[PDB]
């Protein structure tokens, strides 16, 4: 894991944030992200990333 991110705040708007990192590893490589919060079962929780 390179970096984590956590958001805690009431908002109903499509909010976009930015996080930078220093690409120390050279040569073409691969990048991924994984969600840790399980998907909401009902329609009440709209936490979509």
């Amino acid at each position: 894991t390179e970096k984590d991110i956590t958001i805690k705040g009431k908002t109903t708007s499509q909010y976009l944030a930015s996080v930078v990192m220093g690409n120390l590893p050279p040569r073409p490589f691969n990048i991924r992200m994984r969600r840790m919060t399980p998907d909401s079962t009902t329609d009440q929780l709209q936490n979509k990333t």
Partner: protein, 90 residues
């Protein structure tokens, strides 16, 4: 050509400007402006940011906090990030 007539001594001809001038070469005062009001700036102080367009790069010799010449000024969006992984925005 053997003799050198007209010796033409120079005494007070150079004193007439002042006596300390022939021991020390004096100093040059700056020009006074009007919109500047009464702030008599000298040639070895600058407490404001200047513009580096076709100008000379100043030198510093000791102490005496100074301004600078701005080369690049830019505003961007401050991204969230520190020297680590703690990135809480709650």
């Amino acid at each position: 050509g053997g003799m050198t007539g007209v010796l033409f001594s120079l005494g007070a001809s150079m004193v007439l400007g002042g006596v300390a001038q022939m021991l020390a070469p004096k100093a040059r005062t700056p020009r006074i402006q009007t919109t500047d009001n009464g702030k008599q700036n000298t040639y070895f102080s600058s407490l404001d940011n200047m513009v580096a367009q076709g100008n000379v790069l100043p030198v510093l010799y000791g102490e005496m906090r100074v301004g600078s010449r701005v080369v690049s000024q830019e505003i961007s969006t401050a991204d969230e990030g520190d020297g680590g992984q703690v990135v809480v925005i709650g």
